[PDB]
Amino acid sequence: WDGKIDGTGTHAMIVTQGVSILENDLSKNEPESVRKNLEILKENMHELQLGSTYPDYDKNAYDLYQDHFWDPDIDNSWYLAYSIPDTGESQIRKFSALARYEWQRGNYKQATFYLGEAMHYFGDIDTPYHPANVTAVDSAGHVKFETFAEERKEQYKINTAGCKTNEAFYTDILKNKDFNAWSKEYARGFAKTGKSIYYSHASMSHSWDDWDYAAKVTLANSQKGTAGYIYRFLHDVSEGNDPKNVKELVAYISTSGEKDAGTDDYMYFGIKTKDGKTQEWEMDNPGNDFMTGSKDTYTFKLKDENLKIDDIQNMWIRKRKYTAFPDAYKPENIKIIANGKVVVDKDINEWISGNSTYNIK
Ligand SMILES: [Ca+2]
Ligand SMILES: [Zn+2]
């Protein structure tokens, strides 16, 4: 969907309605804590709206908004040595992890921003063009549609999911104790309806009164869906809800803003287990990794499927010199996420030059 940096436009309308919907649908057999936190969230609506639009303006190693797409329909030896690429689904899981982390420890303003960011991605897999994986290159309808829907966003608003917090839609959301598990499938459902509406109503072929129907559905879905996620979120952070085997690791690396803090040198993330076995992946996204000031996301696929978090005794990033050109690197902070829970939050702000191997755990 379209979004403007000041937190306005289709994306902001979706989160804004998502909240307003959760109010109108909120059950009476609903805990004091949940009702209280939703107040906190409304207290930070501006940040929820800003996070909802922002991912379209983040300078990443994703030169092309790659992480904003996802084929809900679609592993191997290669990814034991390389970082896996993120998706619209993947990002929901990551920002929801950050949102929960900040909340549990007090920063509600930034927690709410992160949560709004997660919802940017969900809104996107609820577009017709992103789940169908049709880029603005792939087809001229991507942009013309998202814009058609921009100019009309208002007339597609919805006040309710249709159920109540006691009813069906909202109780399945809570049914599954594993967030990451629930989120993938929840999101898959909505995203699947997207691919479908592309082919039938919202493609460049399919018509103009076809596009009106197309936007109505997907924007309404984006609202009912966004409300679901927020609801889930509100519950998850009132009980200290806590999502097992570590099969993946997500590293969210914030690079410093100071000049020449970025590196065009090779970067690796690695671990050593309690036993003594080790794995290293190259941190390598589509575009330019580790630019000055960017915040990058690397997902890592463990070779030992049956591993638990405490068994991972060590964690480090490692530089290897690209040339004789001195790209020394300054990480501002790095978070490691394992199963929807942040598990490392090392601030750094040191310089790494040469082939140094900084340890973070
Ligand atoms: Ca590359
Ligand atoms: Zn969008």
Side-chain angles (χ1 to χ4, degrees), residues 162-174 176-183 185-223 225-233:
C163 301
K164 278 274 175 178
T165 300
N166 45 58
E167 308 202 33
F169 173 81
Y170 285 92
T171 33
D172 293 302
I173 288 170
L174 293 182
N176 207 327
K177 255 187 293 156
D178 186 11
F179 182 82
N180 290 348
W182 160 78
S183 172
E185 303 305 332
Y186 183 84
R188 163 164 300 118
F190 282 107
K192 246 154 182 22
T193 298
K195 208 175 164 174
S196 297
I197 297 224
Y198 175 85
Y199 288 103
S200 57
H201 301 74
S203 124
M204 266 298 321
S205 307
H206 317 251
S207 121
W208 257 236
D209 276 291
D210 259 311
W211 276 21
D212 186 90
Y213 173 75
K216 171 165 66 240
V217 185
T218 55
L219 274 169
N221 278 32
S222 295
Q223 307 174 63
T226 288
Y229 264 116
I230 300 179
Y231 177 76
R232 178 67 193 237
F233 179 68

Side-chain angles (χ1 to χ4, degrees), residues 1-2 11 56 120 124 146:
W1 302 113
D2 265 23
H11 269 287
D56 275 345
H120 172 93
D124 276 355
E146 280 185 358

